[PDB]
Symmetry: D2
Subunit: 238 residues, 4 copies
Amino acid sequence: KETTSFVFTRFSPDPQNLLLQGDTVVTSSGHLQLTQVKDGEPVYSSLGRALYYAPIHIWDSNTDTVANFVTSFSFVIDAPNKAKAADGLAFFLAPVDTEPQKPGGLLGLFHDDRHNKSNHIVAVEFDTFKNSWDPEGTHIGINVNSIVSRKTISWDLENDEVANVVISYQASTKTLTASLVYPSSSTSYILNDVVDLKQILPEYVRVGFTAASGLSKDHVETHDVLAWTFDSDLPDPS
Amino acid sequence: KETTSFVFTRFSPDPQNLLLQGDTVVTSSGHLQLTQVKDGEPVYSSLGRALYYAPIHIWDSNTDTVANFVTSFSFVIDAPNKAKAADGLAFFLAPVDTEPQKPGGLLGLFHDDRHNKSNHIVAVEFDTFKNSWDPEGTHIGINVNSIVSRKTISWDLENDEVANVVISYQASTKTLTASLVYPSSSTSYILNDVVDLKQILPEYVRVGFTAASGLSKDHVETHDVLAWTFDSDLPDPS
Amino acid sequence: KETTSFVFTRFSPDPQNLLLQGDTVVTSSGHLQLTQVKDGEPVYSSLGRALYYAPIHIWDSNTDTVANFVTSFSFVIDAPNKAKAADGLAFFLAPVDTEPQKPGGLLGLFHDDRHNKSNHIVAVEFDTFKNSWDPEGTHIGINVNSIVSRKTISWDLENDEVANVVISYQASTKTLTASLVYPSSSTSYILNDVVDLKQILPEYVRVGFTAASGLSKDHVETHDVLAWTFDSDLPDPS
Amino acid sequence: KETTSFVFTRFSPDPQNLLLQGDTVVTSSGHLQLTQVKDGEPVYSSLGRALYYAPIHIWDSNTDTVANFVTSFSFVIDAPNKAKAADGLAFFLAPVDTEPQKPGGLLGLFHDDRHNKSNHIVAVEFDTFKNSWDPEGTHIGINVNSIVSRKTISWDLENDEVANVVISYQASTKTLTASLVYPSSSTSYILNDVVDLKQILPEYVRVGFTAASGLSKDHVETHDVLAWTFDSDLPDPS
Ligand SMILES: *[C@@H]1O[C@H](CO)[C@@H](O[C@@H]2O[C@H](CO)[C@@H](O[C@@H]3O[C@H](CO)[C@@H](O)[C@H](O)[C@@H]3O)[C@H](O)[C@H]2NC(C)=O)[C@H](O[C@@H]2O[C@@H](C)[C@@H](O)[C@@H](O)[C@@H]2O)[C@H]1NC(C)=O
Ligand SMILES: CC(=O)N[C@H]1[C@H](Oc2ccc([N+](=O)[O-])cc2)O[C@H](CO)[C@@H](O[C@@H]2O[C@H](CO)[C@H](O)[C@H](O)[C@H]2NC(C)=O)[C@@H]1O
Ligand SMILES: CC(=O)N[C@H]1[C@H](Oc2ccc([N+](=O)[O-])cc2)O[C@H](CO)[C@@H](O[C@@H]2O[C@H](CO)[C@H](O)[C@H](O)[C@H]2NC(C)=O)[C@@H]1O
Ligand SMILES: CC(=O)N[C@H]1[C@H](Oc2ccc([N+](=O)[O-])cc2)O[C@H](CO)[C@@H](O[C@@H]2O[C@H](CO)[C@H](O)[C@H](O)[C@H]2NC(C)=O)[C@@H]1O
Ligand SMILES: CC(=O)N[C@H]1[C@H](Oc2ccc([N+](=O)[O-])cc2)O[C@H](CO)[C@@H](O[C@@H]2O[C@H](CO)[C@H](O)[C@H](O)[C@H]2NC(C)=O)[C@@H]1O
Ligand SMILES: *[C@@H]1O[C@H](CO)[C@@H](O)[C@H](O[C@@H]2O[C@@H](C)[C@@H](O)[C@@H](O)[C@@H]2O)[C@H]1NC(C)=O
Ligand SMILES: *[C@@H]1O[C@H](CO)[C@@H](O)[C@H](O)[C@H]1NC(C)=O
Ligand SMILES: *[C@@H]1O[C@H](CO)[C@@H](O)[C@H](O)[C@H]1NC(C)=O
Ligand SMILES: [Ca+2]
Ligand SMILES: [Ca+2]
Ligand SMILES: [Ca+2]
Ligand SMILES: [Ca+2]
Ligand SMILES: [Mn+2]
Ligand SMILES: [Mn+2]
Ligand SMILES: [Mn+2]
Ligand SMILES: [Mn+2]
């Protein structure tokens, strides 16, 4: 049996147990600011990621076991002009050596808009900009090896309000669930789908966040993570 | 600071840390069978409840603090005829000395269909029968001091399939959230609302489940709870 | 699998999730005052206990499993005259319906000084008075069904200083361990012994504290518990 | 507030969330074999370490807070000839970029036998060989920036028997406590000392194990870690 757990109710200025990639910084309020802000305004063409430093053991070939996990986090997206929001934020799992990929609508996750099993990426996206591969309207998606989500639901942005997300994986049913609640408006969203982590991901992964602002100067928004908890448990075989 | 936590991944016979009320028994598979089964068939006019034995400290007048909690559970409803499903299951919080009330559509929670502040009940119902006070169709509801829910959403019962429920209370925003997922069909539901526990409930409560079958012989279903976790935390004052 | 867990970093004035027996009260500083204090002075012939309200599932005959547990607590004993300290404090496990027994050197645990398998008591005692059955000097003891400890070690009371205790049970080796640290003086103690909980105790028990002041007017001391954490885990069968 | 937690009840063959240094391997039984075994026999001049991959946040200069931690582990030392046992095993905290130092009696921890504040090492040693700087006999020691322990106690190696260790740090009293139990014989040991982590260590450290066999061919023993749990909590300021 193996377990891994961590809690941040805020982030400290030089978080050595996070691997910060691209533009990410920690703000003086203790938030993970994934995309750049200059003089109070979000900057275009920005991409940042943040991963927990330790690999997570999500399945074991030696014992044929697969882990459960539950992660919770709070985030804020603030678009000065809601009609020109872009591009969004994702929680993801990836190989341990993962590096940022293309900005904009590919969210730092993928090098192109195609499906590739060797990406070894599972993500939950909060997608604020309609690309050519996207459904109509802002949406939450489950992504497996592609920016073209396996499943999406409609999601209405409450601009500059705190969103509370919970993502869980139940190995026994191969089910990934993602929910988002805005306590400020009493609105909530949820979806789930079958995702077989043992078939998709390597035995060890890194987990974390990515976000990107739009690739034109007027399509900007912030992507800040305020708090994050993660728990995983890899059971003994039966 | 106080915390309380428990996990049941299955239930034992004569569970001395549960207060079983009405018809509830534990099955040989280790499930909490809230309503009666005779020769493999659900019995009508059955009502059963199950509460954790220890009171939970949900707020403290001495320090003016209010607890957070998160509970998860799995349940199954099996109706021989899905169109004549009745009456449903609820998770609830109530005064420590709570006793079962009326069966059928009142779900063992209430003595009548009226609102009364002295009930001191907060419940999340999974309501399988349209009573005269109900919205159209099967629904999930947040109930405060009445069987007439404060808020409902539509929910389609997946007959004899496992439902995974998560109910959480965030004291800082006075927000109660309930979600339900069916991993078998990849279907999911969520709602939330403002419920001020400090104004509604006593400082200590008991928490648990109630369920009732229909009050006519053809409106029957089982209500089984398979697993249950609960965690609460009452913080120090600021 | 079943788990039970709780934390008190201090105690609130009417703790409804504790079963208080005999003289126990909660002080305005939020301590569990097990033996009586009148006008700042400890009272003789006082006995008090405090149990967690929910029974703990320590073994299961259905699945042939036995629980691990770990408990930590902080306590203070203040004897106005250290040479006339009596009688001490214990942590214990007992049947669910346990009631206080004889005061003084029997510590509220036992009706007499004999061994009896039907007592179903396991205790760790902090014994400040030499009875006829006691080793020389103040001592920590592991007690099983008798006030005559199975094993003792010497322990010097540091008067009115906080003691930090950890008691743990490892089912796989049938080993109970108890340690005490005084951080103020950098002094520590530890012992362990074989106790087979499945053979000694019922499937469910209550857990908590007991303490008694001396049975003569000049042999008095306080017995206060400042904080308490408990965790138990009853595993699935192999 | 930040917390970090992990559990290994056994180790899997390529543990990517551990940083293995020197000779360490994982055995087919799932043990961390810190020093080399060849044809069933321990090899001399062997040094191995194993660190958890993620840095641990032990204090924060921004908020002036200091973390608590508790770690537990099980280990076995098997010396073919008990009279020629060498050199031992330690649990330690060190800078994030820590690398193995000198083998033998310096335990991979130190470059020499001198005290140096820039080492930034806190360790608990299980020392099986009397060096020139050591007390007489096998001992447990608390070491701060030197192989010359601040405090030692006598400890008798129970050859090839499982030892259960618990090491804890209480920030409010600056107290480090270490205990060892052999459940097979019901023998136990404990010591504690004041160690100010904020003054000794950097804000982030890595934690883990080191062990070394003797520097002559006949002074050999195994050093195997069977299981490890770690929990740390960095509180919010007052
Ligand atoms: C599907 O995704 C896989 C896995 O990422 C892609 O294969 C990998 O592509 C990398 C380039 O993005 C290769 O690494 C590079 O190797 C060169 C030469 O040694 C280095 O100079 C450079 O810095 C990189 O490290 C990597 O070797 C390769 N992995 C495997 C297992 O083959 C794959 O990319 C496509 O196919 C491979 C074979 C190459 O032809 C790539 O250039 C090409 O993009 C992805 N497939 C698609 C359609 O995107
Ligand atoms: C039209 C324009 O002004 N800028 C657009 C730019 O078009 C040009 C202009 C000049 C040259 N060139 O050869 O120098 C090449 C391309 O090409 C980008 C690729 O489609 C547009 O990127 C999109 O920007 C959107 C916000 O406007 C979102 O960020 C959206 O996700 C993003 N699309 C992707 C796939 O990332 C970008 O807006
Ligand atoms: C008509 C009949 O056969 N049975 C009906 C029953 O009738 C009688 C007839 C005589 C006597 N008596 O005291 O003599 C008592 C009751 O009165 C019940 C109370 O109104 C009907 O209860 C409803 O039954 C439904 C399923 O049919 C649902 O369970 C529904 O929630 C439930 N309603 C409530 C409010 O709980 C029940 O259907
Ligand atoms: C010596 C004395 O004054 N009183 C003693 C009293 O014996 C008597 C009996 C009758 C009368 N009488 O009024 O006829 C007067 C005195 O009998 C008790 C034995 O049953 C003594 O109890 C012991 O007191 C000690 C502190 O003094 C410790 O608490 C010690 O644990 C306790 N012993 C036990 C077993 O609990 C108690 O002190
Ligand atoms: C073969 C032999 O005698 N090797 C001995 C070795 O000798 C030499 C010979 C030449 C040179 N040189 O600088 O060239 C250096 C060392 O000197 C080592 C430093 O004193 C002995 O190390 C000690 O060995 C002991 C077991 O015998 C323990 O492992 C003990 O902890 C260990 N001592 C230390 C401080 O690590 C080691 O036994
Ligand atoms: C063990 O405890 C009980 C009290 O809890 C005593 O009553 C027992 O006495 C024995 O059993 C009782 C019922 C009675 O038959 C008596 O004659 C027995 O001695 C006691 N057992 C012993 C051996 O002391
Ligand atoms: C409901 O309110 C009425 C007074 O209007 C009261 O008589 C009754 O006791 C209340 N219900 C309870 C306590 O369940
Ligand atoms: C103290 O330690 C540092 C690094 O561990 C080292 O570079 C330095 O030489 C040491 N100082 C001495 C030996 O005086
Ligand atoms: Ca998009
Ligand atoms: Ca209804
Ligand atoms: Ca005594
Ligand atoms: Ca040595
Ligand atoms: Mn999308
Ligand atoms: Mn309803
Ligand atoms: Mn004694
Ligand atoms: Mn030493």
